[PDB]
């Protein structure tokens, strides 16, 4: 057992925030008076996702903080106050959120992105269900399972999803899938499209059209996303300077409009 290990001690529970799938994410106070967010639920499974995020440590990253290793196991982490990105979006602060914001929110997971793209780290869950909103619109990557060292096929890139060939470009894909959804208020990507549909609609060389207001400088970028030879499509490093740069370099004459 190593440094990230505590005794089950100092933490108990004082919330309970979500437990969709497997397991239980409450908030409590750790450690004297720190708060935390707190995981539960081949127990070793479930802390697969921390053996992960006790190697990768960026401020755009969702920071562990320590693990409980034996059952009731847990993973303790960086609490971030306003839930997750979807809930956000679709909710009732997403009605305010223009293209500024938008964008901005954008960068900063390309940026924690762009770290995984350092460490050779590959997520195969980019989508904004897995990105947690915090004070000041600050959104960092979350959902440290399914990754390691280098599945809905609306957020998914073909050659994954098929032959399971997950790169990091295969989390470039769904970064474009996500761009729409941050720019739609949440919406579920290919309206009215199911499962079988959307897989040879999307082999037959289909993409998602402008999102309503947004601008054409965005969407040839989501479409640069989500080229078919998954080593054309960009990285996060040019992402992430493409976003941050935006309305100087990009769209630099940007008006105010309704919905964005
Ligand atoms: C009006 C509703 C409201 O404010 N709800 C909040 C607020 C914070 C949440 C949160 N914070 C976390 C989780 C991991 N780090 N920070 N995490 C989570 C959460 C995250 C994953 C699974 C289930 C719940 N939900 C939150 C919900």
């Known amino acids: 057992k190593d440094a990230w290990e505590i005794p089950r001690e100092s933490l108990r529970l004082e919330v309970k925030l979500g437990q969709g799938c497997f397991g239980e994410v409450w908030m409590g106070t ?3 008076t720190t708060r935390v967010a707190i995981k539960t639920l081949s127990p070793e499974a479930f802390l697969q996702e921390a053996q992960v995020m006790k190697k990768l440590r960026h401020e755009k990253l969702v920071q562990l903080y320590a693990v409980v290793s034996e059952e009731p196991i847990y993973i ?3 609490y971030m106050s306003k839930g997750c990105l979807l809930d956000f979006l679709k909710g009732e602060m997403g009605k305010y959120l223009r293209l500024p914001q938008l964008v901005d929110m954008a ?5 924690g992105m762009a770290y ?11 989508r904004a269900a897995n990105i947690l909103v915090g004070e000041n619109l600050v959104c960092k990557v979350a959902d440290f399972g399914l990754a390691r060292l280098i599945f809905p096929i609306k957020w998914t890139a073909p050659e994954a999803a098929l032959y399971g060939r997950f790169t990091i470009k295969s989390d470039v894909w769904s970064f474009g899938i996500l761009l729409t959804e941050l ?3 949440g919406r579920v990507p290919y309206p009215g499209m199911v499962n079988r549909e959307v897989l040879d609609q999307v082999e037959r060389g289909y993409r998602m059209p402008c999102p309503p207001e947004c601008p054409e400088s ?11 030879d998954p080593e054309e499509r960009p990285t996060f490093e040019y992402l992430q ?4 740069d935006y309305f100087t370099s990009t769209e630099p004459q940007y008006q105010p409009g309704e919905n964005l």
């Open 30 to 32: 750790w450690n004297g």
């Open 76 to 78: 303790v982490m960086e």
């Open 107 to 111: 960068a900063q997971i390309a940026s």
């Open 116 to 126: 995984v793209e350092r460490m050779n780290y590959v997520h195969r869950d980019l």
């Open 183 to 185: 720019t739609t208020k």
């Open 218 to 228: 965005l969407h040839d970028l989501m479409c640069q996303c989500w080229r078919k």
């Open 241 to 244: 300077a493409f976003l941050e």
